[PDB]
Ligand binder design. Sequence first.
Ligand SMILES: NC(=O)C1=CN([C@@H]2O[C@H](COP(=O)(O)OP(=O)(O)OC[C@H]3O[C@@H](n4cnc5c(N)ncnc54)[C@H](O)[C@@H]3O)[C@@H](O)[C@H]2O)C=CC1
Ligand SMILES: NC(=O)C1=CN([C@@H]2O[C@H](COP(=O)(O)OP(=O)(O)OC[C@H]3O[C@@H](n4cnc5c(N)ncnc54)[C@H](O)[C@@H]3O)[C@@H](O)[C@H]2O)C=CC1
Ligand code: NA
Ligand code: NA
Ligand code: NA
Ligand code: NA
Ligand code: NA
Ligand code: NA
Lengths: 751, 751
Amino acid sequence: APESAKEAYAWLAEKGDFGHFIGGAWTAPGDLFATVNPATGQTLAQVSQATQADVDAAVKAARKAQPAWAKDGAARARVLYALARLLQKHARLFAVLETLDNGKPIREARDIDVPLAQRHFYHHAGYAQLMGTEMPDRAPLGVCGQVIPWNFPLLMLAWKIAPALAMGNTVVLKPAEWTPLTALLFADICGQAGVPAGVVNIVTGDGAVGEMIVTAQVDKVAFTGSTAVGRRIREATAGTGKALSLELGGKGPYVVCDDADIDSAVEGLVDAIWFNQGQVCCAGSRLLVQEGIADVFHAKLRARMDSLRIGDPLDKCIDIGAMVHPDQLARVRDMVAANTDGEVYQTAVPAGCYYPPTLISGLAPASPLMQQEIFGPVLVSTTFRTPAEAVEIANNTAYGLAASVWSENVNLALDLAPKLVAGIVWINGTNMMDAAAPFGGVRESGFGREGGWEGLAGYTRPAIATKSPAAVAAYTGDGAADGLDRTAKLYIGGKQTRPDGGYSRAVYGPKGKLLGHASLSNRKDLRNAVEAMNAASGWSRTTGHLRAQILYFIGENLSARADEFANRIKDMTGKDGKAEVAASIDRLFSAAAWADKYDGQVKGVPLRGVALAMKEPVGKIGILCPDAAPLLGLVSLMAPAIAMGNRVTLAASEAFPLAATDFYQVLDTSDVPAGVVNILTGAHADLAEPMARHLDLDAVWGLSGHAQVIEAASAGNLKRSWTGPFDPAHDHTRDILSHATEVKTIWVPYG
Amino acid sequence: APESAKEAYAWLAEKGDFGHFIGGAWTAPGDLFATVNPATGQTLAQVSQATQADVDAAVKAARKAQPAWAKDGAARARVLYALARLLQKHARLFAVLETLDNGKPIREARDIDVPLAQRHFYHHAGYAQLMGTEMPDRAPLGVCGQVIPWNFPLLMLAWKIAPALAMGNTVVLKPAEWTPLTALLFADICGQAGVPAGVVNIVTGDGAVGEMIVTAQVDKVAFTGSTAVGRRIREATAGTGKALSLELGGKGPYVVCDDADIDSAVEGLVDAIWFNQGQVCCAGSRLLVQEGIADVFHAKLRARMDSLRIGDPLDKCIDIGAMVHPDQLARVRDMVAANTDGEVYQTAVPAGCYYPPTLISGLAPASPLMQQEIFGPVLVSTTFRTPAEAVEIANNTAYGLAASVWSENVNLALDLAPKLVAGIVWINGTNMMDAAAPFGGVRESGFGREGGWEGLAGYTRPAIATKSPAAVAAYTGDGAADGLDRTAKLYIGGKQTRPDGGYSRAVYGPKGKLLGHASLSNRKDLRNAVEAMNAASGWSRTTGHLRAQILYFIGENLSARADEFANRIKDMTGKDGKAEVAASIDRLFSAAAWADKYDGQVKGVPLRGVALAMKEPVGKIGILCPDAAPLLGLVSLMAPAIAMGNRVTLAASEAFPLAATDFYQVLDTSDVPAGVVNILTGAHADLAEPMARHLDLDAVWGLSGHAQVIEAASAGNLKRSWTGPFDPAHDHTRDILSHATEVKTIWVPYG
Ligand SMILES: NC(=O)C1=CN([C@@H]2O[C@H](COP(=O)(O)OP(=O)(O)OC[C@H]3O[C@@H](n4cnc5c(N)ncnc54)[C@H](O)[C@@H]3O)[C@@H](O)[C@H]2O)C=CC1
Ligand SMILES: NC(=O)C1=CN([C@@H]2O[C@H](COP(=O)(O)OP(=O)(O)OC[C@H]3O[C@@H](n4cnc5c(N)ncnc54)[C@H](O)[C@@H]3O)[C@@H](O)[C@H]2O)C=CC1
Ligand code: NA
Ligand code: NA
Ligand code: NA
Ligand code: NA
Ligand code: NA
Ligand code: NA
């Protein structure tokens, strides 16, 4: 006997045709479109396609309510707590409504979706309580536009709304056009929880309403959804000064070693088949099994797949629900029709909007199905021989979200996990989620983290704003020839290199004295720099202690030439350079200090074990330095970057390049390994787009302008970007460490 | 061919008879006693027995230099870095000198002692660099008296001096009377490193000079050495307001599971036989082997023990050196002569001050040798059947310092480790040490941590001092009888209990109105409370989420009665109680916030893997609340304690008990599990000594005075203590979380 939907149908009947939740109240229904129960084919309700006028109104209500909301964090905590209690009281109503709207088994909605949504609000209440005293240097961003997909409607809403509200922001959120209902119910309890009017605003519609939110007068955009829409959002927000987080999916690898717990590994994969749909952090879809056990593993997998029960999602004895929508069904069918590799195995499926669990095995690692996105309850599988080959196959995609590793051996599991490119790695489990544990992607899975103390950074700004210094025009001079040899080069791969293009410009002091010449880098020089950083990948695997020693040497050797550097700064700018040199020395010693002291966080979780929120290097970073602070700007950016294990290519000050070129000898005398620090001089108009575009860079920092061009071009590979503000005279070290690292969360057994 | 000591003998000849290093200079030699090379029997040098006048002078020089030293953390970093570089340049001299003085193999001094000492100074330089910006609410303590033992002379010095100096303190340190030389050489390089005069002071002598330092005008005492001297130091410093850390030894268990790597486990134990001497964090001496592999394991152990090379410690091909002193030799011989259990196996030993590696096997878990201290290169062994039995045998001593666990299984290793009572647990290794990883004991192994960010807390105070409110005398009244029933009880084990002694006192308001009666607890009531906390041990194993929910309930149910509580406060004190109630609610919501958010730290280390610096509950805590703040004082102390997993017994305000007694119903309505919170009322003169004495409490917090009595009585079981200052009107939550937790560092494979 399946579960009753009487209460949910009753709420739907009460609410009628839906408008939006704006400014604390329901607007009149507008231009209506149906949401349909995918299991019965019946219309559940009519919802509105928001107009531009609605989106403007919702953003204006969020703006009007935000400052009083931000003022009192203890009062925000009470509201988030009340929202969690209402989610718990109305648990059954939320679960049934999710199943009706989305098609998922009532048992998943009741045991997974709604419990985790409650926990997210319970847990984040406390961040609001603690923000004033524990994050005193942080402040709200303001208004957050939020857009989410159809696979986990309530949970995806909680992941967006709870940390935004906790940190004193207000929200305009649009659920997916296929799954609006539980967000509309969440709106309908906001009054009861004490949510002040206009702090939460829910508008419904398709991607066109999403586009209006993304380009609206908001301080933040947070998106979960497809990679392609992610790219367009990165482009539409380029140069606007908005904060941006993107969770873009990518279904992750499930590594099963020769000594894994076979039965638990099979069961974990089966229990994940229905869960692994849409753009969710998850593992299971790319099955990588050591060749010695692959046949036995696949044989058990097919049999356990046969035990999965398909049908009525309101039946708590059902494991496979209805596909979310006929279009999604057809996408799955088309994917299978488009594949010609492997051996397809399918359980039977009943009539209607159902698709059966499917295993496509016998793929070679190079097969497109191993690298393309996967849709539906579909598994693809390949084998490996050695753990190093498993790492290689797992990291050989454009994605990087979550991974799973199964081994009973204490070493193998803990040595494989950090080598996989992901924001999350589960050891002897999969799809483990907790509000205290950050989750999010690298590569084309996007950027940003949700959950934990770590997730709060994306919903705050520094309490005291800094301001990038204005550009400075290079000094001019008469143009007589230099009888002495004073033409600086570039610094690439541990040695000085002529610019590929052969050109250099004269550098003149404040009164037109010719000081020397500096090279003009081009794209071929940058590409040589990137190859030099690729050869220096070992630097990302060194100890913190080794990197500290290096930075101490750089600091020492700068001190030995401190007078020379100050006079070079004075020659170029006319201002005394001693204070800038003393501060550049200091920034090095601060970075040396930090190199072995930026700790990962151990999270307690209600599940098995603990979540280890590790810090990791971003990788290779291209950096454009400001005109001002010829030496301080370069060193302040370079030093925390390499302290944390990154390799960097810096475009030195365009107005005043000769301090950076004098620094070459400092790097050589300090034994900076080749490729760890590369330095380009010349016109930033020539380099900004190439550095932001480059497909083999993991981050671009543009602190000399060109923010729009840089942020737009970063969409090519969805690299992280930072375009300031950056004030060299301000010690940004601690914040730069955050720009220079990624969080990877490793879930391990414990206690 | 053994190593040359020409350079070390030359330095010894240059320095002559030794005075002390005081105020930046060497004092005249005084009352001389010899330090003797234990391998040759030859006198190495004469050193001075410091007088009281010397100790006064050294402390006065440390005091005179400290404030200018504390002012500039970047300059302190340069000095610590220079000290590390000098340790590295003179590495060979330090190593040889350590071997000459102590007897240890030159290979250990050169590969372990001196490298780790360098690393400690390199690593801690950075804390000095970062202190101003990253610990802005913290300030130096001032002058530190430091006393250390003979087993690792240079390394023990580095563990004391480097964090003290980094945090802006100055030091007076006394090495052990048997091993002064490398501390005197460390003194001899301080000038070259830029150590300003009087920032480091080294005085030599026996325990009588240690006694003078401990009771001198210093702000901190830090001791490593025997449990008995630790107790006397806790007593001599009782009531003085001095900070205190004690590292008291206890040789730790080495758990070898049925599925361990047998050969690596045996080798790790053999390579640890010589290392595990004196009061050092170490594991190996108590061998616990699963019964299925015990015979094969012991057979391999005896054979590998035979391969250990004994002789000339200046020979780099030697594993077993000379015993540190003839008295230590005799202590070992007496221990073996005193034992009658087990089967003793011994390798041969050569003539002189040598003792051979010894295995005493076949002990039952109850044998004294399994629980007493062990001396020399001696191993004792017993077997177990199940992992739970291994946990039981390992935790069945008065000690709790370090432990080792060997298993190839990913779960078993990570599930056994947190169950062992220790400050350190090594998985598939032993005696792993790093400057970033905290180490220190629980139980009779002492208290405090050395190393890492965590170790800095013991060398700092809050930058802004707070002040405990003055005592308040209970109001008096005429003494007419109460025709109504208004006699409050105690709250013990989840239910209200009459005081064992049967007595209660009348409570009068400011004008002599009889408000009711409050019970007078005695030692039998406290003992009932402790048994109630023992039955509530499960609370220490709950999730952070469960504990948060409980605290939220307490906060909610206090809010429901907020007017009643404010009027009760007003009845007792004559002052309006609304603000105290609102703040008591807030403290609960802050603690609820923190319950699932106080994260452990993941340390990068130059060795295999990572060090997980976990937070853990202290356990059972007895708390004495101040007179002032009848409700705020109790709640502010109770709530962070139970947020972190502790069970508590609080002695409520002596002047104003009736708010705490009204709180009983709040605990019952909030479903606080029985024994988690117990409340005693009555005279703190009756309870202070019993709570500080009690052998089954892990900590005592005395915030109502009696500091001397409490701190002295805490020496019985060497429980942690805190005697303030505590100002209820100040939000101490974050600092109380530190009082309410212990750090356990778990070293695990990784990458
Ligand atoms: N049978 C087939 O071949 C089907 C193809 N698709 C296609 O998949 C693509 C995206 O897949 P979905 O699962 O729908 O994820 P999505 O990325 O389109 O949706 C995630 C969220 O983004 C919103 N959104 C969509 N476009 C946006 C934009 N330009 N700006 C801002 N927000 C926007 C959506 O309304 C939704 O709430 C589309 O090209 C769609 O046509 C999906 C299903 C059927
Ligand atoms: N053959 C035997 O039976 C021997 C017995 N022992 C005994 O062991 C006990 C302590 O063992 P040790 O290894 O020497 O460690 P310890 O705890 O005595 O020494 C650690 C450090 O504490 C200093 N110290 C000693 N007493 C002190 C005090 N009252 N106040 C402050 N500092 C003090 C010491 O001088 C040393 O630098 C003593 O009772 C000693 O007589 C040690 C060796 C030989
Ligand atoms: Na629907
Ligand atoms: Na990315
Ligand atoms: Na857990
Ligand atoms: Na000696
Ligand atoms: Na203790
Ligand atoms: Na390591």
